[PDB]
């Protein structure tokens, strides 16, 4: 049993474990997106790299949450990771829309956990989120939004040409 736990509610402990599951689930989704874009019949290497990097970032997010859970004297509890929502992710546009949907859901979970910690007078939890997660997520969402706009600009008339150019000229490869 913990000899350190202090000001760390059971409600926050449980919500941290759920947020871990949401981050790991997001990582898994991004692994599936990344490998889809590496298929021989899709073959958009910059898209593949973008999602593979997100998979790693989301995993790191989960690991930071787990580290904090132990630092506070909470107990990590793991659940199943549900498989991603799709087996094939459509076009780069479809994929980036799906990514923004996912990130908005993670952001709302962060916000919901921050509200819980504020209500429970848990300022360490609030600070931990503010310092490692909230701004990182806002910056990520802004980048995805920027990408989506450029993707959309490029569909117009000649969607294949637009998809190739976005991958070649915007995404790292």
Is residue 14 a contact point for a copy of itself (CB under 8 A)?
no
171 binds, among a copy of itself, Ru ion, none (CB under 5 to 8 A by kind): none
Is residue 106 a contact point for a copy of itself (CB under 8 A)?
no
Q: Which regions of the chain does DSSP assign to beta strands (E)?
A: none
**CA angle centred on 85, ends 80 and 89, rounded to 5°:** 140
Q: Which CB atom, from 50 or from 133, has the smaller least distance to Ru ion?
A: 50
Which position among 14, 102, 131, 172 is part of the footprint of a copy of itself (CB under 8 A)? 131
- Judged by CB under 8 A, the chain residues 75 through 94 that form the site for a copy of itself are 75-84, 87
Which position among 16, 93, 109, 154 is part of the footprint of a copy of itself (CB under 8 A)? 154
Q: What share of the chain is helix, strand, coil (3-state, %, to 5)?
A: 75, 0, 25
Name the nearest CA neighbour of 24 among 85, 79, 74. 79
What's the min distance (Å) between Cβ of 117 and a copy of itself? Answer: 10
Q: Are 167 and 46 in contact (CB under 8 A)?
A: yes
């Amino acid at each position: 049993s913990s000899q350190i736990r202090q000001n760390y509610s059971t409600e926050v402990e449980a919500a941290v474990n759920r947020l871990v599951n949401l981050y790991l689930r997001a990582s898994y989704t991004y692994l599936s997106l990344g490998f889809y874009f590496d298929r021989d019949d899709v073959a958009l290497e910059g898209v593949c790299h973008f999602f593979c990097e997100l998979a790693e970032e989301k995993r790191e997010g989960a690991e930071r949450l787990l580290k904090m859970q132990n630092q506070r004297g909470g107990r990590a509890l793991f659940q199943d990771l549900q498989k991603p929502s799709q087996d094939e992710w459509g076009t780069t546009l479809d994929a980036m829309k799906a990514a923004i949907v996912l990130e908005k859901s993670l952001n709302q979970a962060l916000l919901d956990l921050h509200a819980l910690g504020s209500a429970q007078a848990d300022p360490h939890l609030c600070d931990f989120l503010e310092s490692h997660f909230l701004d990182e997520e806002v910056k990520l969402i802004k980048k995805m939004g920027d990408h989506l706009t450029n993707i959309q600009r490029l569909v117009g008339s000649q969607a294949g040409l637009g998809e190739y150019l976005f991958e070649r000229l915007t995404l790292k490869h």
